[PDB]
Amino acid sequence: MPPYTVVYFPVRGRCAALRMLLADQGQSWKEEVVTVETWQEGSLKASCLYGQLPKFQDGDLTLYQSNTILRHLGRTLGLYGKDQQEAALVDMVNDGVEDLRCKYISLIYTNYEAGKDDYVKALPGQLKPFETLLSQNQGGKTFIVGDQISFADYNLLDLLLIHEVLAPGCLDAFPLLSAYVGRLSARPKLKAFLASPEYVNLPINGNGKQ
């Protein structure tokens, strides 16, 4: 059996980025999918630390919280900076990614029809700090932090892809971002994952919006 197990609802959501990590890194993993009926039965839920998914297992290490998983994988597979200073910068990117993700998730599930124009109007000002980060790291030719990939790249990558779905062309205002996205998705294993039914046949979110 693979050492890793992803326990989630059948969507990309907060598991998209860590799945891309694992795929690009050539790791193997079991997917455990949870239906509404099963969630509604309440036994799994009660057993989750914060009563939510994703749930992740690495051997007998059981983790909750999507960014915990990302950092845990970034730690063990060496995608967490080359040094302590880089690691901080990697954290600083991911906190920003999370911040925007929280807003995205709020729009998608609590206020899509009403808030979408305001959201898209505000999108440029929200993406710009990431464009700025690229420009300050080797002309944005390599990765979000340093010259080696990190978990934040995989998280940022997902974030930009879902926003291109939400707001087609949004990256037209951000040359570095746009290319970044093309480049990281050209990575052979990731590209193969992204084109696969495993990724493509899952809806981004669970309410049918995007």
Ligand X SMILES: N[C@@H](CCC(=O)N[C@@H](CS[C@H]1c2c(cc3ccc4cccc5ccc2c3c45)C(=O)C(=O)[C@@H]1O)C(=O)NCC(=O)O)C(=O)O
Interface residue list for its own copies (CB under 8 A) = 49-51, 61, 63-65, 67-68, 71-72, 75-76, 84-85, 87-89, 91-92, 95-96, 99, 102, 125, 129, 132-133
109 binds ligand X (CB under 6 A): yes
List helix spans (H) across 143-187: 151-166, 175-186
Contact (CB, 8 A) for 151 and 98: no
Q: Is 29 annotated as a binding residue?
A: no
151-166 helix and 16-24 helix, angle to the nearest 10 degrees: 130
Q: Is 14 annotated as a binding residue?
A: yes
Separation of alpha carbons 13 and 84, rounded Å = 29
Alpha-carbon torsion, ordered 186, 188, 189, 193, to 10 deg: 50
Residue 30 phi/psi, 5-degree rounding, is -90, 135
Residue 207: name its binding partner from its own copies, ligand X, none (Cβ under 5 to 8 Å by kind): ligand X
**Site for ligand X, residues 1 to 30, rule: CB under 6 A:** 9-11, 13-14
Which region, judged by CB under 6 A, interacts with ligand X, from 64-72, 75-83, 111-119, 147-155? 64-72
Residue 210: name its binding partner from ligand X, its own copies, none (Cβ under 5 to 8 Å by kind): none
Q: Is 112 annotated as a binding residue?
A: no
